[PDB]
Design an enzyme around this catalytic site. Structure first.
Site, PDB file in Angstrom:
ATOM      1  N   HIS A 197       1.341  -0.945  -0.057  1.00  0.00           N
ATOM      2  CA  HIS A 197       0.011   0.251  -0.382  1.00  0.00           C
ATOM      3  C   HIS A 197       0.565   1.489  -0.161  1.00  0.00           C
ATOM      4  O   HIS A 197       0.402   2.435  -1.131  1.00  0.00           O
ATOM      5  CB  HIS A 197      -0.988  -0.166   1.495  1.00  0.00           C
ATOM      6  CG  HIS A 197      -1.779   1.174   1.622  1.00  0.00           C
ATOM      7  ND1 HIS A 197      -2.412   1.847   0.317  1.00  0.00           N
ATOM      8  CD2 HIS A 197      -1.859   2.711   2.994  1.00  0.00           C
ATOM      9  CE1 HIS A 197      -3.350   3.018   1.192  1.00  0.00           C
ATOM     10  NE2 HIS A 197      -2.568   3.327   1.901  1.00  0.00           N
ATOM     11  N   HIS A 226       2.982   6.922   5.056  1.00  0.00           N
ATOM     12  CA  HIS A 226       1.375   7.453   5.700  1.00  0.00           C
ATOM     13  C   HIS A 226       1.511   6.628   6.905  1.00  0.00           C
ATOM     14  O   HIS A 226       0.215   7.672   7.428  1.00  0.00           O
ATOM     15  CB  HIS A 226       0.912   8.074   4.726  1.00  0.00           C
ATOM     16  CG  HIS A 226       0.392   6.717   4.178  1.00  0.00           C
ATOM     17  ND1 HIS A 226       0.936   5.277   3.628  1.00  0.00           N
ATOM     18  CD2 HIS A 226      -1.330   6.210   4.278  1.00  0.00           C
ATOM     19  CE1 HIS A 226       0.325   4.941   2.798  1.00  0.00           C
ATOM     20  NE2 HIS A 226      -1.147   5.210   3.350  1.00  0.00           N
ATOM     21  N   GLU A 255       0.761   5.697  13.645  1.00  0.00           N
ATOM     22  CA  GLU A 255      -0.535   5.091  14.392  1.00  0.00           C
ATOM     23  C   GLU A 255      -0.443   3.459  14.039  1.00  0.00           C
ATOM     24  O   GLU A 255      -0.812   2.688  14.660  1.00  0.00           O
ATOM     25  CB  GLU A 255      -1.398   5.551  14.210  1.00  0.00           C
ATOM     26  CG  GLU A 255      -1.884   6.788  14.865  1.00  0.00           C
ATOM     27  CD  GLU A 255      -3.661   7.251  14.474  1.00  0.00           C
ATOM     28  OE1 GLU A 255      -3.888   7.007  14.436  1.00  0.00           O
ATOM     29  OE2 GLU A 255      -3.043   8.965  15.383  1.00  0.00           O
ATOM     30  N   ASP A 256       0.238   3.031  12.669  1.00  0.00           N
ATOM     31  CA  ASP A 256       0.004   1.494  12.082  1.00  0.00           C
ATOM     32  C   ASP A 256       0.941   0.730  13.316  1.00  0.00           C
ATOM     33  O   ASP A 256       0.852  -0.127  13.140  1.00  0.00           O
ATOM     34  CB  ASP A 256       0.182   1.482  10.952  1.00  0.00           C
ATOM     35  CG  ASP A 256      -0.901  -0.301   9.937  1.00  0.00           C
ATOM     36  OD1 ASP A 256      -0.973  -0.679  11.597  1.00  0.00           O
ATOM     37  OD2 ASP A 256      -0.298  -0.358   9.594  1.00  0.00           O
ATOM     38  N   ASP A 290      -3.332   8.144  -0.554  1.00  0.00           N
ATOM     39  CA  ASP A 290      -4.089   6.290  -0.721  1.00  0.00           C
ATOM     40  C   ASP A 290      -5.647   6.268  -0.976  1.00  0.00           C
ATOM     41  O   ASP A 290      -5.505   5.212  -0.982  1.00  0.00           O
ATOM     42  CB  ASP A 290      -4.365   7.357   0.842  1.00  0.00           C
ATOM     43  CG  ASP A 290      -4.479   5.979   2.287  1.00  0.00           C
ATOM     44  OD1 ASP A 290      -4.089   5.274   1.500  1.00  0.00           O
ATOM     45  OD2 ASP A 290      -4.663   5.919   3.269  1.00  0.00           O
ATOM     46  N   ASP A 301     -22.655  16.322 -26.606  1.00  0.00           N
ATOM     47  CA  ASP A 301     -21.722  15.634 -26.293  1.00  0.00           C
ATOM     48  C   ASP A 301     -21.193  14.533 -26.504  1.00  0.00           C
ATOM     49  O   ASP A 301     -22.020  13.109 -25.871  1.00  0.00           O
ATOM     50  CB  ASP A 301     -21.029  15.792 -25.034  1.00  0.00           C
ATOM     51  CG  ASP A 301     -19.210  15.278 -24.524  1.00  0.00           C
ATOM     52  OD1 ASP A 301     -19.094  14.439 -25.542  1.00  0.00           O
ATOM     53  OD2 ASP A 301     -19.400  14.641 -23.038  1.00  0.00           O
TER      54      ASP A 301
HETATM   55 MN   LIG Z   1      -3.412   5.270   3.730  1.00  0.00          MN
END
Ligand SMILES: [Mn+2]
Ligand SMILES: [Mn+2]
Lengths: 536, 536
Positions: A52, A76, A80-81, A143, A263
């Site tokens: 990711h 990023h 916190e991970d 993200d 269009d």
């Molecule tokens: Mn992310």
């Protein structure tokens, strides 16, 4: 049909393609830190941890951002991970990367609001307060884009909720910054989950007619280039495929049923200069009748997200509608990758402030997404058309006199009237942009008047009018210095000189050795006594 | 051969030609006041009183100044020559007219200084302190011009002293403001009294050769327009007569004897745009060999008095030198009437301050009157030449890659090397303006490299390089999704399918209903298992 996951070496090399060794070392240290952060800490689905952030950084490199933004995209989801904290990142690289990562995490910690526009404004305010820039917003958009790309592994309700948040917040924000690729992809991938029936219905409806549409395009493209390269203006271009979510945007509008949506994924035309843009506009208007009110000038009235183009729907081929777009390559870079494409001692002071201001106005622009005339008389050049297709530029406030003198000098001197888009106008009438002007001419005419030098705006026209008046003054004084003094000198005494009019008197006039013989007569327009005594 | 004295009605009508009724009433009241001021108070020579202020105001209207300047020129010799005082004028019209007239009178009250440049600086300081504008300076220049026009009635020593003051102060000041007509006239009329021998010698030396020079001009003009109108660029122009005092300026320079003075009153060329200027430059360079070092670019390096042109001395016709000048009509207005030609809520706040600054730098510019490179990398567009004569524009910092891609797309894709004015340069080399560039091409070449997108500057070139790389990626993935998966699917099991390769399998590949058949192969560059099970 799933675009692959790229490795880290490929992204590092693609960043090397436009960076120096120091930024490469910075992003490589960031990548190694991100790898060692979540080691032995994988996702809920079992997929590796670094995929990711690697894909986020790859999408950021695809936009070719500053190295700090790419490092933040690599880092990023580290604070916190994992066990690594914000102070660890601040001591590791810098304070700016810490600000970016903290902003990304804070916008990951979102709150519900009673109103929808108010929660959009809250998502905007968090950014603007923590980062007047878009670096945080860009990392969060990457993200969310990678989340939308890998959404099929999630439960259907979570898919629909994430797609709703994307359609209501992230995609309109990407549109706010002018980044159009991410906007289109987010909108399509969100409609795929929110309404797969309508998505695939639009797909298989476009399928049947896109063949005859490719034929229509190819033919119109061929004719356009064959008639444009004759006026000696080059333009590389191609057809513009209409994305699905715009089809649904106009489709859900009850009036605009898919059939004869006016269009019809027409052709775009990239060219070098704005004058070339309006020349292509005139050429397309002369090759096919334009539909009334279907013309939009996004160059003189740019969209608040810096979008800049020229749209015109014409009759074209057998098929009724075709909405050709015309813009320059800088305008294309803008309309494609917004601020990230736009991105001096300190180049980050005014940049982020102007970006914050453009976002603070684009919020109101998104509350009313359509035209919503902005601001203005700021543009300095108005581009006017000739009925054949030629387009000429003038300074703002120019009159048809300036137009005529720009076409040709003699054509300008013998001007009488003017017709602006088929309307008999005065020569004093100001010229707007785009309107077609044709002047009335006839060689049986004395010429301009004293008012022409005043009401004209182009310096060239004023210069030619001054030149004309000076030529007329010269010929006037020469006529005087022939007739009036041909009698006034010796009214009776030159009766012999009226009998004999030789060229030896021309020679005794040449001993004064003034500039020219015509000047020998022109000086008499002021003094008449000099040639009165030297009649010998 | 004396240009006449104009009346007041003519000047009032010529001011009406570009003013409104209120300014006309203002100047008419000023004229009547000036008439009633010096009534029964004539000059020492017996000539009427109002002739001098009327001619001053006529010269000011000839420059089309503000009504306050024309009123001051009407009332410049009223305060100390009559019973009317400064307070009378301040109560009559305004405070600004009083300031202008008081400044004109103060500069009429001049002082001697030990140094010459210092007395010039004192004349500059009186103005700048009392008027950051030029209105006072313009009125005084008109006064001095009319004094120089009517100087023959004065004693010879006074004539020579006034001409010396004009050559040392007033003419260089007029040159400082870019007003070139007044400069030339003052210089010629001052040389007429200071050195009549040299004046008339230069005159009768120009006489003999100006006929063959008119022939040279006419022929070069004809050839130039015949070869310029072919590239479809219009330009009204004429020959530039070299004034006498410039001839003496170069003549007194001992090296520059009159014979073969390399400037020989060549032709000027007025055109619409700067790109057209450089196109005419290239055309003239291709029609005749330019003399080395005789090229001066006063457009990218403007003279400090706002002068803006392009000078180039070429071999041309039978005669060896010809120094063609090229400029636009705005540049012509500037180079002719300076600030007065240039002259928003308040348009007089920044105007006069910038004019004071340009004068404060033009003092140093007049201490070293020649080239004296000023300031710079400010210009955004560099104009490069093709060896045939075509001139193309690029953003500053462009590389020959951008040049090649601007010439043609295919020509750009197959670029190898580059030659700038006959020098083998690198593709990374930056492009200056004016130098001739020709790129090396050959269709036997893969194309660009990854570094091309980085070192390029034109957005068009970057766009075409991205397009080329994406096409190559597509064909690469198609080759993969043909060969590698043509074996990898059923290496032994498709031996029958290797025997029978029909189009029904194409149809079972079309039921996936992806975008294109080429896309049916291109998607295999990512996923290879989808077509592995549907080989049926
Ligand atoms: Mn992310
Ligand atoms: Mn005076």
């Amino acid at each position: 049909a799933n675009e692959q996951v790229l490795t880290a070496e490929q992204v590092i090399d693609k960043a090397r393609s436009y960076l120096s060794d120091e930024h490469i070392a910075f992003v490589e240290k960031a990548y190694l830190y991100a790898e060692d952060a979540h080691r032995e800490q994988y996702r809920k689905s079992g997929e590796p941890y670094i995929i990711h952030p690697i894909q986020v950084a790859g999408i950021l490199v695809d936009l070719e951002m500053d190295p700090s933004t790419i490092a933040g995209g690599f880092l990023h989801d580290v604070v916190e991970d994992t066990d690594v904290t914000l102070d660890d990142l601040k001591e590791a690289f810098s304070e700016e990367v810490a600000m970016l990562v903290d902003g990304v995490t804070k916008l990951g910690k979102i709150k519900y609001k009673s109103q929808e526009e108010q929660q959009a404004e809250n998502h905007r305010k968090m950014f603007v307060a923590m980062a007047q820039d878009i670096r945080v917003i860009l990392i969060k958009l990457a993200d969310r884009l990678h989340n939308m790309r890998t959404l099929k592994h999630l439960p259907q309700e979570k898919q629909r909720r994430i797609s709703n948040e994307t359609l209501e917040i992230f995609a309109p924000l990407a549109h706010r910054l002018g980044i159009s690729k991410i906007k289109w992809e987010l909108e399509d991938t969100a409609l795929r989950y929110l309404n797969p029936q309508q998505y695939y219905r639009i797909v298989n409806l476009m399928k049947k007619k896109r063949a005859e549409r490719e034929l229509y395009v190819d033919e119109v493209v061929n004719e356009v280039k064959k008639r444009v390269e004759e006026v000696n203006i080059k333009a590389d271009f191609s057809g513009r495929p209409k994305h699905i979510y715009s089809i649904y945007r106009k489709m859900v509008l009850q009036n605009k049923q898919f059939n004869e949506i006016y269009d019809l994924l027409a052709v775009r035309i990239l060219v070098n200069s704005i004058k070339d843009c309006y020349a292509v506009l005139g050429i397309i208007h002369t090759c096919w009748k334009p539909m009334p009110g279907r013309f939009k000038d996004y160059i003189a009235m740019p969209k608040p997200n810096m979008y800049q183009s020229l749209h015109t729907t014409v009759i074209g081929p057998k098929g009724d509608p075709l909405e050709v777009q015309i813009r320059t390559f800088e305008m294309h870079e803008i309309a494609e990758y917004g601020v990230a494409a736009h991105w001096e001692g300190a180049t980050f002071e005014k940049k982020l402030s102007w970006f914050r201001e453009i976002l603070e106005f684009q919020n109101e622009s998104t509350d009313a997404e359509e035209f919503m005339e902005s601001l203005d008389l700021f543009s300095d050049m108005v581009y006017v058309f000739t009925p054949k297709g030629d387009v000429i530029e003038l300074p703002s406030g120019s009159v048809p006199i300036d137009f005529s003198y720009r076409i040709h000098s003699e054509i300008g001197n013998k001007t009488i009237g003017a017709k602006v888009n088929g309307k008999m106008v005065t020569l004093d009438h100001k010229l707007r942009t785009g309107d077609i002007v044709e002047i009335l001419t006839s060689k049986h005419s004395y010429g301009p008047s004293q008012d022409w030098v005043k009401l004209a705006q182009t310096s060239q026209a004023k210069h030619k009018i001054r030149q004309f008046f000076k030529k007329q003054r010269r010929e006037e004084n020469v006529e005087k210095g022939r007739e009036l003094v041909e009698k006034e000198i010796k009214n009776l005494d030159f009766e012999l000189k009226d009998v004999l009019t030789p060229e030896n008197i021309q020679k005794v006039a040449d001993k004064f050795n003034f500039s020219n013989e015509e000047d020998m007569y022109a000086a008499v327009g002021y003094n008449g006594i000099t040639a009165l005594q030297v009649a010998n």
